[PDB]
Amino acid sequence: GLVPRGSQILCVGLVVLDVISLVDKYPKEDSEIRCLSQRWQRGGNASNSCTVLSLLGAPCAFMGSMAPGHVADFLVADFRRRGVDVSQVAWQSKGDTPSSCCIINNSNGNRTIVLHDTSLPDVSATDFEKVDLTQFKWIHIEGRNASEQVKMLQRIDAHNTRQPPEQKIRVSVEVEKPREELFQLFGYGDVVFVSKDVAKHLGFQSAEEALRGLYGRVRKGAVLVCAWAEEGADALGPDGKLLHSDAFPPPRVVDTLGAGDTFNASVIFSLSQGRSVQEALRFGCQVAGKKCGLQGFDGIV
């Protein structure tokens, strides 16, 4: 169908089928057991943010790798359940669609996780070349395979070079895995999200340390953003003023899975509506705080 030009927010990243089982006790090897309950869930960073953008009322699209098959089928139907545009998926001829198994030990809250295999090629710069960008007002990249994503980021840069300033496509970038390859991505994006977990691995002990210690790495004009769960969130832009919002914790914490993807999408959404950085931090924190008191994404409204 027809997508009006410059109307969609695109997220590029992982999607994965998560199978989650609740058990009485951790299973002894070679044993056969019944779980208390079991869920199949669409997972992944870029994937979660798409769900949030849709619920927020943004037209949105996902770009990631899948292989034809039943896993893909379940994931595509869930994507569509959430009003996500999947027309830019990069279908592969090799590899598994990512899927993962999690066992939550009911009597201690321990999570044991068999992560997906590593057989499916990530999205390539050549896959990205084939995409017509005019559809997109904002493009967001979950850092994964950096060297290739750098080329995608240069391609978008190139595109914007030729556009009026009101046909420019905004870009955001997430570095959430403490992996050296990823650190080059700081150089790209109007907006750069760094995770608490990454900040801590570089040895910063607070959002303020992280932002002040990393800002030197961002491109001129960029805003660097870092959320620290219960401690709220900071951003830092070209004017050197450290901004902050306190968390908006919920009555009780139910489910924090994907809370960070909820923050990222809300910040992106707010800014894409022309709100200020300060306004976006706050909204980001409000939405993510709500999410933490809910099971899944139903009701973050």
Ligand X SMILES: c1ccc2ncncc2c1
Sites of contact with a copy of itself (CB under 8 A): 19, 21, 23, 26-38, 40, 70-71, 73-74, 96, 99, 101, 103, 105, 110-119
Collapse the DSSP code of 43 into the 3-class scheme (helix H, G, I; strand E, B; otherwise coil) and give the result.
strand
Cβ(188)–Cβ(160) under 8 Å?
A: no
Among 104, 247, 286, 294, binds ligand X (CB under 6 A): 247
Q: In this structure, what token pair is assigned to residue 250?
A: 């919920």
- Choose the contact partner of 113 out of a copy of itself, ligand X, none; CB within 5 to 8 A by kind: a copy of itself
Q: Output the smallest distance, CB 45 to a copy of itself, in A.
A: 11
- Choose the contact partner of 67 out of a copy of itself, ligand X, none; CB within 5 to 8 A by kind: none
142 carries a ligand binding annotation: no
Identity of the amino acid at 240: G
Integer Cα distance of 76 and 64 in angstroms: 11
288 carries a ligand binding annotation: no
- 225 binding ligand X? (CB under 6 A): no
Contacts of 241 (CB under 8 A, 6+ apart): none
Greatest alpha-carbon span in the chain: 64
260 carries a ligand binding annotation: yes
- 292 binding ligand X? (CB under 6 A): yes
Nearer to ligand X, 125 or 229 (CB): 229
Among 230, 242, 273, 276, binds ligand X (CB under 6 A): 230
- Positive or negative torsion for Cα 275, 278, 281, 282: negative
DSSP 87: T
Nearer to a copy of itself, 74 or 219 (CB): 74
Instruction: For residue 129, count other CB atoms closer than 10 A to its CB.
Output: 10
Nearer to a copy of itself, 196 or 282 (CB): 196
Q: Output the smallest distance, CB 35 to a copy of itself, in A.
A: 5
Antiparallel, parallel or unpaired: β 90-91 and 65-66: parallel
Among 229, 275, 286, 294, binds ligand X (CB under 6 A): 229
230 carries a ligand binding annotation: yes
Cβ(98)–Cβ(44) under 8 Å?
A: yes
Burial class (CB in 10 A: 0-12, 13-18, 19+), 49: buried
- 281 binding ligand X? (CB under 6 A): no
18 carries a ligand binding annotation: yes
Nearer to a copy of itself, 86 or 271 (CB): 86
Q: Report which of 23, 42, 34, 91 is spatially closest to residue 63, judged by C-alpha positions.
A: 91
Q: In Å, how far are 190, 198, 225, 226 from 204, measured between CA atoms?
A: 23, 9, 14, 11
Among 6, 121, 187, 249, binds ligand X (CB under 6 A): 249
Q: Output the smallest distance, CB 251 to ligand X, in A.
A: 10
Nearer to a copy of itself, 5 or 111 (CB): 111
Residues annotated within the binding site for beta-D-fructose are: 18, 44-45, 48, 261
